[PDB]
Design an enzyme around this catalytic site. Structure first.
Site, PDB file in Angstrom:
ATOM      1  N   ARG C  42      -0.771  40.814 -36.485  1.00  0.00           N
ATOM      2  CA  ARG C  42       0.519  40.803 -37.484  1.00  0.00           C
ATOM      3  C   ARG C  42       0.277  39.869 -38.312  1.00  0.00           C
ATOM      4  O   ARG C  42       0.927  40.090 -39.440  1.00  0.00           O
ATOM      5  CB  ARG C  42       1.453  40.102 -36.089  1.00  0.00           C
ATOM      6  CG  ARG C  42       2.827  40.154 -36.672  1.00  0.00           C
ATOM      7  CD  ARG C  42       4.042  39.618 -35.836  1.00  0.00           C
ATOM      8  NE  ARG C  42       4.282  38.310 -36.208  1.00  0.00           N
ATOM      9  CZ  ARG C  42       5.361  37.753 -36.642  1.00  0.00           C
ATOM     10  NH1 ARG C  42       6.312  38.583 -37.140  1.00  0.00           N
ATOM     11  NH2 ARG C  42       5.438  36.249 -36.954  1.00  0.00           N
ATOM     12  N   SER C  56       7.681  42.660 -36.974  1.00  0.00           N
ATOM     13  CA  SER C  56       8.216  41.736 -35.793  1.00  0.00           C
ATOM     14  C   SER C  56       7.366  42.183 -34.715  1.00  0.00           C
ATOM     15  O   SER C  56       6.679  43.485 -34.442  1.00  0.00           O
ATOM     16  CB  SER C  56       9.445  42.196 -35.426  1.00  0.00           C
ATOM     17  OG  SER C  56      10.446  41.385 -36.454  1.00  0.00           O
ATOM     18  N   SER C 145      14.917  47.074 -24.330  1.00  0.00           N
ATOM     19  CA  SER C 145      15.862  45.894 -24.338  1.00  0.00           C
ATOM     20  C   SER C 145      15.143  44.728 -24.216  1.00  0.00           C
ATOM     21  O   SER C 145      14.262  44.363 -23.522  1.00  0.00           O
ATOM     22  CB  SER C 145      17.045  45.834 -23.389  1.00  0.00           C
ATOM     23  OG  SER C 145      17.684  44.608 -23.582  1.00  0.00           O
ATOM     24  N   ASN C 146      15.163  43.830 -25.471  1.00  0.00           N
ATOM     25  CA  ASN C 146      14.742  42.452 -25.535  1.00  0.00           C
ATOM     26  C   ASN C 146      15.429  41.260 -25.429  1.00  0.00           C
ATOM     27  O   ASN C 146      16.418  41.122 -25.944  1.00  0.00           O
ATOM     28  CB  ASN C 146      13.685  42.455 -26.927  1.00  0.00           C
ATOM     29  CG  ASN C 146      12.876  41.369 -27.127  1.00  0.00           C
ATOM     30  OD1 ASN C 146      12.734  40.393 -26.248  1.00  0.00           O
ATOM     31  ND2 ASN C 146      11.750  41.470 -27.838  1.00  0.00           N
ATOM     32  N   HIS C 199      13.189  56.641  -8.928  1.00  0.00           N
ATOM     33  CA  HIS C 199      12.371  56.985  -8.171  1.00  0.00           C
ATOM     34  C   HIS C 199      12.262  58.514  -7.648  1.00  0.00           C
ATOM     35  O   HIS C 199      11.321  58.968  -7.211  1.00  0.00           O
ATOM     36  CB  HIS C 199      12.449  56.373  -6.600  1.00  0.00           C
ATOM     37  CG  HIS C 199      11.140  56.462  -6.032  1.00  0.00           C
ATOM     38  ND1 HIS C 199      11.309  55.756  -4.835  1.00  0.00           N
ATOM     39  CD2 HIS C 199      10.092  56.678  -6.231  1.00  0.00           C
ATOM     40  CE1 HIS C 199      10.081  55.845  -4.197  1.00  0.00           C
ATOM     41  NE2 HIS C 199       9.247  56.519  -5.079  1.00  0.00           N
ATOM     42  N   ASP C 203       7.476  58.520  -9.817  1.00  0.00           N
ATOM     43  CA  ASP C 203       6.675  58.115  -8.560  1.00  0.00           C
ATOM     44  C   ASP C 203       6.038  56.681  -8.556  1.00  0.00           C
ATOM     45  O   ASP C 203       6.095  56.326  -9.924  1.00  0.00           O
ATOM     46  CB  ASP C 203       5.965  59.099  -8.049  1.00  0.00           C
ATOM     47  CG  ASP C 203       5.478  58.832  -6.343  1.00  0.00           C
ATOM     48  OD1 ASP C 203       6.139  58.255  -5.803  1.00  0.00           O
ATOM     49  OD2 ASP C 203       4.302  59.356  -6.152  1.00  0.00           O
TER      50      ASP C 203
END
Lengths: 226, 226, 226, 213
Positions: C42, C56, C145-146, C199, C203
């Site tokens: 970065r 970012s 999602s952060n 599930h 798997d």
């Protein structure tokens, strides 16, 4: 092999557990809190008390969480159909193992730290050795469950049907932490805290704010004066 | 884009997996177990075996969990409507990846450690390249699923419909542990263990006892002599 | 006390989110990914850009996860009744806090790293301070999602109804790692990644492969050239 | 004037005085103010409000109010803070409950309204306690005049550095003292109970950690 009939006391419990877990969508969060400062504070308070009463590490958690609820009222609220119910007072319910009951401590955001320790001791003694009036353990605005006494590092709990949050407390560890010493590290004690939230009411952002706010209060007990 | 019809084999798995999660409430626990001693014991036994048989680290878990169930029979039970079924035997089922099947090892609390290793190898060989009787892999009283061979640190698994507990095993790491040496630390391997329990049958207190009892057996393989 | 009527926007989300959790069974996983190489890359890319745009750390996650979906197409699929639907293109939806919306980045497996950074900035600006077309935030094939910006170590998130996987990203930290130095260790930054899988579709074995494959891509950014 | 004169000739005044160590308070103030990060400023007077308020709970006799044929008792402590006005006494309600920083915000807003505006009449009448500060003008120690309905009133002097014997090779160190003077209605507040309240106030202020109770 052996078959044991179910008791009526456990029957309702099972119903509540399953129902609350299934009806509410649960998303879980977790952080790690440094306990170096609290232990130092606890030594000073217990010394000055001169044996009048003892303040447990769990007592700090009650007040620290209670003040966090005031700063983030969303976690203290409750969900109802067509209305989101907001609670301005915080009645933290502390779970205690019983051959499992949840005594309720009222006005946890107001009463002093020491009176909480006296209240929890009296309620726990009454719960194990006697009878509690039904309102005294029904209808809490929050719930805290502690399992660190058994060596559990981290776990997740199940919420009550009317509440919106519940804390899960692990055992206090000893973990290396990087430092600026010539050795580059020092020994510090950490506890993992896991929070279970109803995603309908508590969003990801607001839940993070409450948990981060709880860390700041507990990471420096002086700030609990607000 | 591409659409794939669902096979009946995956279909029958679906409802069993579907029903289990939405009917059984789910609460999970987790700890960290030191694996240092086990490895020392494994080196001696494998040597003692002289190639006659091999004992995997997974094999120690089978007996350690089995003996833990005897000391805490509540975790080994099974929930039925209006009656909590109790099992005095521990038929442990071991999960193995299959292009997912659950062979059953009968009487894991009785048979020797090495006989388990022979059983798991033969059953896995029969499972992957052959055919197994439905019973052989249905109706287990306990379940162990291992994913540490792929590098997973920790995870939680779905519970079988009739059972009450299931174990989740992560990968063996290398972590610093504080010590009394002049350097203040030493390298010791760890292994995260996650237990998922039906909260109707397994309370937090009894669940913690089983996980702690399993922990004590595994830190010192001498104690498996009971 | 105070009662707040529920807005229709919350009502739409509540029934959409509650239905997803009570229907889709959820099993989770967790690993730790080293950020030593990512930060170094970065620094080079941002420097050479000479202020045109900023890449970012979240942007590296978008492409690394997207390429992982190509190598493990099972996780990218979507469950439908009587037919499992497979997606060849990977449309990744990124969650951003909104006083919670999920903008969609199309063709994440094709477009370059820098264009993702420009796309996420423009969409987020429109999301917070404007109106977005429904499809632009509906029907994503994946979700990220952060919550590392708030200090959360690790958490698990709810899944979307049509999707099959979702990544939960914790906050970066500084942890000791054993090494061959004369001090025996060095400081390396870590981060925890938690994945929630259906599930029925994903798997345990295939889920581990995707998460392990994600680690290898992110642990060495040179390999993202494929 | 009427109230002042009447209060003196109807209430028999008798005074107590002690010296309180402020070394620990300043260390806490540096941290908290730092924690506030400019959000709010916590004055040394703000610690006095809570420290006195909690002392009233532990010694409820000082918080009471004398009436004819009946001694009225107050379970809440509405502390009134005196501020110079070209002299008015704004009231801070529930001083024994609200947090330390909210008191600082309350006193600032009330003081601004008092000096540059009009206060609603109930906002400065009928307090259950009174605190007057004159340390900003260099007064070492003084005694005040009580309100007619109240039972006690605090008087605070200026802080100064005084030598205190120590175990140092030098035998001493520098610690900042300050003098606190309390005026009590001897009809309600006896010597023993008055001493307990003033001694209890010292312990709370001498170690701010104990303010968590």
């Amino acid at each position: 092999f052996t078959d044991i009939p179910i008791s009526n006391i456990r029957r309702v419990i099972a119903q509540r557990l399953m129902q609350s877990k299934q009806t509410i969508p649960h998303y879980y969060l977790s952080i790690d809190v440094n306990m170096g400062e609290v232990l130092l504070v606890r030594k000073e308070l217990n010394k000055m008390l001169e044996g009048k009463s003892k303040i447990s590490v769990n007592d700090f958690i009650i007040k620290a969480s209670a003040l966090a609820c005031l700063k983030v009222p969303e976690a203290n609220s409750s969900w109802m159909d067509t209305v989101i119910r907001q609670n301005h007072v915080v009645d933290i319910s502390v779970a205690v193992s019983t051959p499992l009951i949840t005594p309720i401590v009222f006005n946890a955001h107001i009463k002093g730290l020491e009176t909480i320790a006296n209240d929890v001791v009296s309620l726990a003694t009454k719960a194990r050795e006697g009878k509690l009036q039904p309102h005294e353990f029904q209808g809490g605005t929050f719930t805290i469950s502690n399992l660190g006494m058994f060596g559990i590092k981290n776990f997740s709990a199940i919420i009550n049907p009317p509440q919106a949050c519940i804390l899960a407390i692990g055992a206090s560890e000893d973990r290396l932490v990087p430092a600026d010493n010539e050795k580059g590290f020092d020994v510090a004690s950490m506890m993992s805290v896991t929070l279970s939230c109803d995603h309908r009411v508590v969003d990801g952002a607001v839940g993070a704010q409450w948990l981060a706010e709880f860390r700041k209060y507990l990471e420096k007990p002086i700030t609990m004066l607000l």
